Every structure is written in C-alpha cells, then in structure tokens.
Amino acid sequence: TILHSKRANVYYLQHCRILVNGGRVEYVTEEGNQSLYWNIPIANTSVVMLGTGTSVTQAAMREFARAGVMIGFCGGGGTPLFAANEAEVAVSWLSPQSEYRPTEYLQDWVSFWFDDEKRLAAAIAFQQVRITQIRQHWLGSRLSRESRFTFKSEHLQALLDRYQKGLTDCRTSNDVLVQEAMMTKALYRLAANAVSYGDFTRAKRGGGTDLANRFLDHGNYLAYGLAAVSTWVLGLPHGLAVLHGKTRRGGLVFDVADLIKDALVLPQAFIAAMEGEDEQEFRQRCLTAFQQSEALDVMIGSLQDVASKLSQVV
C-alpha cells in the first residue's frame, strides 16, 4: 500500500463507463462503434472525479474502496452535481468504508466541534494557513519561473496583512465570511492584473463564459477531491465543517480546499487563460502544482495541527 500523500494520480473522467475487466479497473470510452479500455492504477491514485456521462459498477467500487480511493460524482465542467435555486450539492462522495482509519484526530475533532467558539477558532486557523500558503506559493520559486505572472510583492503583502488583521476582529462565522469576500475580491483583481487579463468579475453562480471563470470553476473541484482525501485519511467525516457548513453539504471538504485553492489554483487559472489553453491543459497545471507543492500534505498537516490545538481530551 502506497501512502496517500505519495500517490501521484488524480483523475477527472467524463463520458465513459468504469468497470472491472480481468481483475483490473478500467474506464471505457465509446467514441464511435469501437470501445477503448484504459487502465486506472488505483494503488497509485488518491481520488477519481466522475463528471457527465459516467457510470461505475459495484465491482469497480469494490476495488476503489479496498485501495482507499475516494470517489466523487460532480456535475462536470465546473458545475455542481445537483443545482437548484438555493439548493446545491457540489459532489456526492462515496467514501471507502472498509479500510479503517486512525481514531485520534476524530476524537480530537468531536471533542470541540460542538462548541461554537472552538469552531470559530478552527475557521480562523484555516484562514491563517491560507494566508501563509498564498504568501509562500505566490512568491516562491515555482511561480517566479512563470514570466506571465508579474505583480508587485508589496501589494500582495498589504492584502494578506490587511486580511490577517481583519480576522482578529471577527467574532462570528459570518464576520469571517465577510472578510474572506473582501480579501478574495482584491486577490482576484491582483491575479487578473498580473497576467494583463483586463476586466474580471468572479462568476459566483458558476455561469461564467470567460476562460478565467471556467478554469476557476474546474480547479475548485480538483481541490475538492484532494480535500475529500485529506479528511478521509484522518478519519474526519465531511459534515463536520467549521466555516462553510452552514450552507453546503460536505462542508469540511470546502473548508479544507480553501487552504490551497487561492494559493495554487488561482494563479494557474489566469495563466492558462492568457495562454489560450483547453481544460485538460489547465488540469495538468493544477495537478502538477498540487504535486510539486505537496498540497495533500498541506491539507493533512493543517487538519492535524488544528485538531491538536483545539482538542479537549485530557
């Protein structure tokens, strides 16, 4: 068995049937009247996301679970699986139930999760990790090699420090959501100007037509799958959220994705937009950034730190 943070494969599949053929897990594409079989290395895979036109068999789900592979059904193309006027389910997660997870972090989590103040402290602690991650990867060596992404370091520093001070003034979870909105709005403008994108407004409803909004939508679901693996590895149920629980099902997946979403996905979205790339080329950018930045380790390590900080065990 390979450790999840060492697994190198994240899959996003559409228009194919996933079954077991000769004991091996394969996804079958039917472009034409000929079927094509593609092997999935589940031992080296952490998460497989299933979009439009996908199906899975029970035998395939058996192998996924035994290998500890998180399976999620999403809407495809950056859309939620189920969308309504206010109702929305982003991803239906099929968590493996057969590979027993450690217990210590779960006991730490439930020991404080029902305290309103301790849940607020966890949410702030997530945003502080988010600030650290943005400062690190927006100014690091990997992104400096991208000559297309040019911005004034003082502008980002003033932004992160303004958000850092705003978090201390927060007293409710809604206060933090307001500060996150202000910070993310200025951060979108900074990333847009960094690539000479021109005018940009984030399509919060997911109905954006420009390449930046489309890539930001798709990049979020890539981050969701990585966050779903992080909470599972530590035996944390997706429903024990700290910030985005009061609106969305599977909230902790969204909270944990925020740890690396703006730091890794956001710059790659605007870069790929100005390069005129398709979805797969932008997908390879996010996946590579996830590997090289050890994004899975960041989410797992952040949850472990927060769990021990707020634990109420003796």
Next chain:
Amino acid sequence: TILHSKRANVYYLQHCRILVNGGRVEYVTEEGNQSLYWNIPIANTSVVMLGTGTSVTQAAMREFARAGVMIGFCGGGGTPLFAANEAEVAVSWLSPQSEYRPTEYLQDWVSFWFDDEKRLAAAIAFQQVRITQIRQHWLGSRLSRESRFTFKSEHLQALLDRYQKGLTDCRTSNDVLVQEAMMTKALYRLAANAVSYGDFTRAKRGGGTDLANRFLDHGNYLAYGLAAVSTWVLGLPHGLAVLHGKTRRGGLVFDVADLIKDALVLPQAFIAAMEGEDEQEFRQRCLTAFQQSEALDVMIGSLQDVASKLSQVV
C-alpha cells in the same frame, strides 16, 4: 426480501443497472431478477445499498442527491460495506439546503463518550445485548434444526449466567475485557465440543490453517461488514468504540459486530468445518443467519437504545 433494515429503511439491490430515463430514475433489472425496486421511495428516508451486479450513472446519482437518498456499495447479500455517502450531523449551526436527512445519533454519542463511566455503561449494555442474542439464537428454532450442533442447554445457561454476574462486578474497561475473554474462551469450547471438533485454539492475526479458524476469520469479515452498515446509516464514525481501545482502528465496528457475532457466526463456522464445506457454502450459512435473526436491525436498534439512554443533550 430487499428491505434489509426495518429500522433504517435500508434496501438491498442486485443485478440491475440504475439510470435516468425521461428525467425519472429507472431500474433495468436482468431478466430473472423478479425483485420490486420501483417500489422504493425516492425520498430522504430511504437508504439504498448496491450489491452484486449493479451499476449507477452520474445522472442517477444526481437524482439521489436531489432526493437525499444515501447510496452505498456492498458485497453480495448486504455485506461488507465497500463505499458510501456519509450521513451528516446537522445541529442549529449547520443548516444546509439539501434534502438529506441528518442524524442526531452522533451528537448523542459524543455527549457521553468522553465520560469514562458513561463509556463503560455503554460497553456493558453491549455485552448484555450480546448475552441475550446468544441465549436466543443458540436455543432457537433455526439452530435446533442443525443435528451436527448438539449441546446441553444448561451448559450454555450456566456459562452466560457466569458472565452476567461478572459484568455487574466490573468497574473499569479492563475488567470487562477480562470477563469477556473468559466467557469467549468458554463459549468457543462449548461450540467446538458441540460438533465434536477436538482441539481448538483461536488463531489470532488471521494465522489459522484449520477450517474452524478460517471460517471464523471469514465470518468476522461478514459481521464487521454488516456492522459498518449500522454505523453508516446512523452517521456514527468507526473511531468511537465503547469496549475496544480508543486507539484501535475500526473499534466501534468491532464492538457493534460483537453484538451478534458469537450468537450467529460462531456456531456456523464449527458446523461448516465439520461438514467440510467451502467458502461460498459457509458464506451462505452466515447470510441466512443474518437475515433470519435480523442482525442488522439488532445492531441498529442497540446503537439507538444506548444512544438515547446515555445521551446528555437537551
């Protein structure tokens, strides 16, 4: 026949493709499967497990997500549980716009689990249910039809009465572990003698070559898999055991499986060993025992009874 739990509305499906036709969920069953899956309410009260020979499309998962129907994948006959949606714990501070039905049992469980005295009462309550199940199903109609398994009912009564007296003297978790080990050693001897097996030593770590230990290993797998179904539908995590050590992975699943394991699996393993049966034949003996003894409902009901009795909420 397809309703595996009356308490949780858990339906088991096999040999059918689940898809969406004309905006409706439809079940394309193989000719020969004369089950009635169209009668399953597509509402948040229903739990659907997909067994042997099933498949599901992304479009059907969307409908299940819209209706709040939890989907799970299991092995043949309803065990083991492979992968499944998670049941979220919604309090007043986690109000999502999803039709899923949240479980109150997780908050009930956490409200007493950290109290060492309350955690002990739950463990003793489990062993009481265990005593009842052994008493009931070792002397019931189904097992009396087995001519190979012959024993004097007084021996079983005295064995169980001895263990019940020991439980009332226990004051710590370790006291219960010592009493259980004595009862279990005596019960395994009673079973081995009931079939005239001869020498029997329970091989830990799955390292037994004799048919008795092998069948006992396989039957534990089927019991743990069924217990995973009970914690899944109640939204209880595996890491909150009541008798097993707090650091033991999957401890709660093992505790829940102990409610019915010795009552149902233990006699069948020694019978099948003495009859020289194979894996598939012994697996059928266990499934039949689970179904006729309502093992899933016993586990679901016991967790509910302990949860409501020991809860500290409101």
